[PDB]
Amino acid sequence: MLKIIIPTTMLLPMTWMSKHNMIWINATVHSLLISLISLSLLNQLGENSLNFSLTFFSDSLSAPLLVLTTWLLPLMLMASQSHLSKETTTRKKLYITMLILLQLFLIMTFTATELILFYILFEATLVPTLIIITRWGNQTERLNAGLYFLFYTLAGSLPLLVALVYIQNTTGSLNFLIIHYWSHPLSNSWSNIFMWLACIMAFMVKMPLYGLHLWLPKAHVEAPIAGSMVLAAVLLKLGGYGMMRITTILNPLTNYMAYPFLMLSMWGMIMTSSICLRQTDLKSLIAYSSVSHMALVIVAIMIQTPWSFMGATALMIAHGLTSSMLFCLANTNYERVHSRTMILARGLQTLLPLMATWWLVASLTNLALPPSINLIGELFIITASFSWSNITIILMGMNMMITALYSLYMLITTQRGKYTHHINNIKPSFTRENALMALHILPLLLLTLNPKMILGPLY
Amino acid sequence: HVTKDMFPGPYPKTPEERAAAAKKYNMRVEDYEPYPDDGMGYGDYPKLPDRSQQERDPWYDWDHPDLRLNWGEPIHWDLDMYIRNRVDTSPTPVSWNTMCKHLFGFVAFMLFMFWVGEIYPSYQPVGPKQYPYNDLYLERGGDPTKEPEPVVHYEI
Amino acid sequence: SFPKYKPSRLATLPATLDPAEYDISPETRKAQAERLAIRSRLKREYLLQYNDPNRLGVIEDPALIRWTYARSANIYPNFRPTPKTSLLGALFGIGPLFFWYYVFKTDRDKKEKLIQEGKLDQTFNISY
Amino acid sequence: AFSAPAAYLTHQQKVLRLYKRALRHLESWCVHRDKYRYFACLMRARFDEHKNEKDMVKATQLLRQAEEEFWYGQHPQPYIFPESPGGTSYERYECYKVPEWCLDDWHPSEKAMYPDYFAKREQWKRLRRESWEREVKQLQEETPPGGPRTEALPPARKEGDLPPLWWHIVTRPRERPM
Amino acid sequence: MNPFASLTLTTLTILTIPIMMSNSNIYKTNLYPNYVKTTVSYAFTLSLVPLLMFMHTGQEMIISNWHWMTLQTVELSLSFKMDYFSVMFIPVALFVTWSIMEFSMWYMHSDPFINRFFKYLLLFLITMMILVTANNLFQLFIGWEGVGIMSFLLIGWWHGRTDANTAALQAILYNRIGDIGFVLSMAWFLTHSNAWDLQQIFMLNNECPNMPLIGLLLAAAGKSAQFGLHPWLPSAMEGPTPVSALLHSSTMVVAGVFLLIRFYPLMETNKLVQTMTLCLGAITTLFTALCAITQNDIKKIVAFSTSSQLGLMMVTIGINQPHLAFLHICMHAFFKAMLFMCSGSIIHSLNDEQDIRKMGGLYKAMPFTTTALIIGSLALTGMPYLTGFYSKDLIIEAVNMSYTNAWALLMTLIATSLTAAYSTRIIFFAFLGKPRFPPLVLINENNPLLINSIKRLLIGSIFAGFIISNNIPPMTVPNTTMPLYMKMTALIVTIMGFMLALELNNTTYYLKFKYPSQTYKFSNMLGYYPSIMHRLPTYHNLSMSQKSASSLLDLIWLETILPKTTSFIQMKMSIMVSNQKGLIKLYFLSFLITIMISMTLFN
């Protein structure tokens, strides 16, 4: 695994020893090459895992997340090139350093054979994101947003640490392989109930769970474009990955303890999809859509059936790509209009036709149009839920209908109708933005050809 | 370019701050009417008529012809509810209650009559259709190891 | 005499059936004149800024920003715990959760019992 | 559409608008032209019998019963001209309307085609640049103190002046740009 | 080597080549629409071969060519079903689409984006063929959603028009309501039969339960605009007339019916679902014909006619006669597509005028449209030995000779009469009287594109019923003996419809005016269903979406509970802790207190 970690570390001295006007080119080229190298982790086994060493191991759940993490950095650099133009070389190098450190921590987090090492890196990712949000955000609310994004996380994560060390004091190890092979049932006890809660709540808060989702709209709205991209694409999936790893020690207590979270997610997906219908801000609408999709992923993980896990993996990958694309489109509009109010700039199809095509395809993938991987994950989760209980179909279908409604509402409001007359600074789309949009969308339509790459270890 | 004094604030209590709020929203003091002071966070915001954007004059030269809005005029709290793409409140040729009664009445009658027609079906003066080999026993389900009871068809 | 039109929330009163327009007064006329004055002043400011050849950007709209700020950021500082607010919040935020919990719990208990007696007919049920 | 609206509609304007609406809806009811002509002459006669009423209270009690009767028998599916706000081709060609400023963003290779058009466009832009400076002063001096009362604009007064705020009325895209 | 599979796949494959060239140079020229039309015609003349092979032998295939992902014991593969329904419907759809494209070459000549329009039409055709030939439920869902997205794009063709966007979103909403049942059925079939392939579904379901069939019926009701979910089809007339003629007239809207035809082995083993389908079809056809007989927009009248014919199709399905419903689909394609041909010709000649109150004497002013529309109306109402006869007459006979609802039978007969009524309404108000259009006459039919495209479907509407009925093998036992009056019932009710509607139309010439009745108002405003159901639910949803979810819970109470409470408590505790005046007297008094307390409590 060092053949990916070491180049990502070398990205830092290369960035800091670069010319003042070569940082973006060098960073983009070498991050793309690192993505290409990481692409060879996809050759997974039907047996246990790719156990590289005592410290790092790869799995067909970890490999798609690793590849998406490596692929996201070049897109983040391309998106950040525009709004950082008027800023000094040292500060741009610091921004690229924060992005590189975030990638390094995420890469080490997804392999992380140890649960304490996983926790340490899973919490180390917090610092670069907070600095990016509270340093290079625009509005005055960013500081407040950062505070939320901080404390919520720690409010969930501090009990987990205690639980973790407690387990190693009883089991003797926190290695995931030993934990899986030596797993034992949890008796229905108050102590075991609180151990279950301490294990679950940390990952629940970062999905986020419906009741615990307040930090996400603030953090995603006030963050710069690279921050929003990394928050929606990779950082939300840490909770799902952690739950998928940790639910192996929580059986059979998950059967009883899953009910409040299942109800919260099943009702909150409807609530947040309905919230999307009445939203005056593009970024907030995209954030609430992310909350709905992650609610579906929470349901899938809580059901803990093979089809549930496959659907959850597919949906995590598809949502990451789609939400990053949607945020990039919103930012392309914002850098022209500087308002971030959906109703202000209207009828952009007549002025930006190719960008309108990008908007249409992004809305189509968000709408879960078959045979996209978005719908593959959606349908697998829905079928698993139907087997779990036939009444889930009402909530699932209502969520599908509202999702289509708000996706097409977002498309029609911004692209169709009549152009706003007083806005005359809508310049033609740059090659950088179109390239960014294509680099988001072609991986999705190309992954629909080989779904088993993103269906997880239970395929 | 908006200052702090030009943003929505708390519910006005005295007529002086009521006049200040009316002046802020570019509308007459006599026309200004905030939402009732309840637990909802309406605060200081005009309660415009609940009429939809569709019934606004379509021959006026609006600054936003599609939305039928002017530049500085106060925006209804539920603008995104009434955008000619969504629910409209335009007067109808028939009263709402009359339409509701008629629609409900028609649906109920059809539903009732379908149940009645289920009670009293329509058919022809014929006996059951007959099929030769033990009512097609082996072609419908099979189990050829059971030898079912023979059913004999009458010649008439 | 003809049948009377009864207005509703979603089918409002027509302008030509409004008694207020037929009841004219000098105060009503001056109110209309000054409403037109406000509208004309706003229109003049907008068109003066709109036709300007030097302007190369979005014309800032205070009304739109007031709308968005009131919709988003003016809510909580103007919130008070009230019997209406408290009961509505409790109902609309707890009742659906417990209702769905009851429904799903009853369905799953019935399913589990039926599996216990074995009278479910789970034949060909391979994928779950 | 073009004309600025007033503060209110006078009684005569209300009566004339009711006359036009009733005639159009009667045409919707009376499909054939001879039947429509007969009933429209009857309708005009029924308007004319109270043309000379001097009592304003009487005239206002009238037009009210009349608009109530209209709302009772208003043909809930009246004929609409296709381009009218209720027609089947009302805003059909708005997607083809492109603003004129977009031409400023064209590539030089695009402007290499159509050189005469862009030369004339440059002339128009220069004319706008000078006329605007004249227009601002003229509007400032002609507007009454305290702000305008009606959104009606004055014409040019001198020889070389252009009507104030003319650019976006003269440079409309077209009724059917494509 | 047995060219059946190769040719039946080559059809669908060559349908996709112009989409590949959509980035080439020809897409930037004016020869692209003719290229697409020629490709479609070649596809039709190539698909005529499997039709002949089946008609000779009855040849059947499943072609599972590409194996896509496998899910433990479930295998998903790209599989095509090439049964009677597919090999019969493909040539009909290709012929209709060929006529539509030739017509569009004239109708949409002034549209700046005509290449795009043609491209959109081909994409819809491809998705429809994917829907029709699918062997498993996932592929058929792909086609199901593809035709819906193409419909959304083509309805909102003029995206500067608010009403077009509203209608497109309406269609999406209703089709998602149907999609709920589609997904329910798919989940049930996977959970219980362990398959989405049709063969395993048929093998393992000898007595199909209620849930999968109810989901299928809900999907069919959504996509074929049945009574609960009907208004989107009349609302869809916002798109260009070729779009209305191809998608929402003859090809896309039958898809729901097609689905119930595709699952007919399971429908015949369930008795309650058949009754539900029969009642839904009966109420749909009655209500839509009732709405049609009073409309003034010609496209609206033809759309309501399409809805009534779809309701009749699902009545046929509900009386357990699926092959007859398929035959009706095939005939209705021809004559309803030609009916929109004539409507679009009239609209174009009269300067985009769609109201029949302004269309006067066109019987002589434009004669080819007149004769084509007369022939189409005769085929629609049911005229002995025409294309619509061989389906509709058998539909009526089967409904009379079955153990069904009395009310459903009555409503089917009344719907037939009202079909005759709205046909004569169109003819009388558009072709017979004196002219009522503006004085400057621009009427012109003399364009070979329009003439040829209309006349191909005209020859179809005359002879296709006879040819197809005499060429397909018999798939049901016929009704050989009937009462003399009960054999004539269709003709009797149709002639009564003509006579009564014509007599009531002739009274419009009388120099007499009266105000409308309650029944007229109910019929004109579509039972008031679009008003109430597009104002009460939507508002009551959207309002809640802002009042409770967005503000009461998300912005107020969820903030009040976790973060605001914590901030308030920590604030107060910090204030209490850090507020000491700096007087060491109080400090050492507390020291004495703590010291005294410490000694006593511990020991």
Ligand SMILES: CCCCCCCCCCCCCCCCC[C@@H](O)O[C@H](CO[C@H](O)CCCCCCCCCCCCCCC)COP(=O)(O)OCC[N+](C)(C)C
């Ligand atoms: C502009 C108008 C169109 C012009 C172009 C016309 C041509 C269109 C043809 C292309 C699309 C049509 C679809 C037909 C697909 C043909 C190729 C396909 O069959 O091959 C696939 C093979 O492709 C791969 O399966 C999918 C590609 C994998 C995508 C990886 C993403 C690239 C990395 C980018 C970064 C990652 C970002 C996202 C993180 C998760 C599936 O083959 P498969 O049967 O299975 O086995 C392969 C062969 N074997 C048998 C020897 C093993």
Ligand SMILES: CCCCCCCCCCCCCCCCC[C@@H](O)O[C@H](CO[C@H](O)CCCCCCCCCCCCCCC)COP(=O)(O)OCC[N+](C)(C)C
């Ligand atoms: C706010 C946004 C979302 C945040 C996250 C929300 C999710 C947290 C929900 C916690 C999951 C369940 C917690 C406890 C489950 C135990 C089962 C219990 O509910 O059922 C009865 C439990 O009975 C009563 O509940 C006893 C406890 C009563 C006191 C609990 C307080 C009630 C409301 C508190 C909710 C506040 C949550 C937030 C705290 C800050 C059965 O009684 P019994 O069969 O005999 O004993 C079963 C347990 N044994 C077997 C181990 C002995």
Ligand SMILES: CCCCCCCC/C=C\CCCCCCCC(=O)O[C@H](COC(=O)CCCCCCC/C=C/CCCCCCCC)COP(=O)(O)OCCN
């Ligand atoms: C987003 C903000 C959420 C804040 C955190 C939410 C998670 C809360 C989970 C509990 C926190 C601490 C749990 C302890 C960690 C696990 C250790 C463990 O399981 O050991 C138990 C110990 O169990 C405990 O001590 C639990 C005591 C909990 C005290 C703190 C209570 C915190 C609030 C309680 C109410 C809310 C609980 C769920 C909240 C969910 C989040 C909203 C048994 O060990 P022994 O006692 O040694 O062996 C038995 C024989 N003697």
